[PDB]
Structure 1
Amino acid sequence: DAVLELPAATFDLPLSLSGGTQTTLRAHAGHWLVIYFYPKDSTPGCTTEGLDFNALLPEFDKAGAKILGVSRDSVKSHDNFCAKQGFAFPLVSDGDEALCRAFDVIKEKNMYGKQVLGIERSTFLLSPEGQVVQAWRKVKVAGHADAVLAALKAHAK
């Protein structure tokens, strides 16, 4: 059922959250987890994606699922983004890109005559036993949160 195998150490990585606490993926054992990676706090597309998930939070709750957004911005940046937008789910400050590399979302592009790395907008659904059962890569924001919710409902049944 897994579409991606993560290094075992990934599940014990301490993930710094908005609000000043930490979590780990293993700490989410027992419920579904949506992990959405986005390139940058407080941009038009990334704000749209976060607000879309936030608007659907009660529907994710009805499945007992939790959501985590992830970028490499600082905790302070995440706190400001969460406060301004009213997000009711946490953002991971993956400043060292450890979680991003585990999910293989750091992608290289030949541009400006160089090799340029960056976060590719991507989302994953993690089962209550920690298996990555669905992945979306190179995500277009429009319709995405709705599609993730629909897939979660399909898997959780």
Structure 2
Amino acid sequence: TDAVLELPAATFDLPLSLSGGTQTTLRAHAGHWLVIYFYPKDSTPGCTTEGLDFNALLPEFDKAGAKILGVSRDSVKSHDNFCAKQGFAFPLVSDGDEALCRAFDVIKEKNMYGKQVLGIERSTFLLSPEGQVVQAWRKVKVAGHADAVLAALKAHAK
């Protein structure tokens, strides 16, 4: 009833490779809020702006007990390099096989170049402490976005 998206049960048990070398799963985040933001490519202008915006708000997300995860299909090494250069203090998921992306339906198609072209669409989601996807943002406008996500989280957490 409060969910805006339904994920396959197996999604919650997928091993998610993180920057820094560990793995997590969505089920492992039970009991707290989780922000999951998908972005198309490490170390590009919009993706860097977005990451830095979430990073600046980390104390506010902490106040609410929430954790953040950024997601792209870049490698663990790429993610480590991106985190170190930018000073990110939250983890990035290396979704190399796009399993997490597909679960959240963020791989979108565009008819371009006389081809059917698939790519990550910038998207963010709020996962409740009980594992429900309760809010979504798709075709994300980076400017103002992290602020909007924080505000929505606060409104939901009540």
TM-score tier after normalising by the smaller chain length: over 0.9
- Superposed CA offset, 1:70-112 (max 9, x none): 0000000000000000000000000000000000000000001
Q: Deviation at 1:155?
A: 0.1
Query: Sequence identity of aligned pairs in percent?
Result: 100
What is the alpha-carbon distance in structure 2 between the residues aligned to residue 133 and residue 91 of structure 1? 21
Give a deviation string over 1:23-71, Cα, whole Å, max 9, x none. 0000000000000000000000000000000000000000000000000
Instruction: For residue 133 of structure 1, give the secondary structure of its aligned residue in structure 2.
Output: strand
SS across alignment from 1:108: strand
Structure 1 runs of 4+ off > 3 angstroms? none
Aligned to 1:8: 9
Normalised to the residue count of structure 1, the TM-score between the two structures is 1.00
Classify the secondary structure of the residue corresponding to 1:115. Answer: strand
User: 1:141 aligns to what SS in structure 2?
Assistant: coil
| Alignment match, 2:116 | 115
1:104-156 CA distances to partner (integer Å, 9 max, x unpaired)? 00000000110000000000000000000000000010000000000000000
Q: CA deviation at 1:19?
A: 0.2
Partner of 1:63: 64
Give how far 1:2 is off: 0.3
Gaps of 5+ in 1: none
Q: TM-score, normalised on structure 2?
A: 0.99
* Structure 1 Cα separation of the partners of residues 68 and 54 of structure 2: 8
Q: Does 1:89 align with 2:96?
A: no
Task: Give the equivalent residue in structure 1 for 2:36.
Answer: 35
Matched residue SS, 2:36: strand
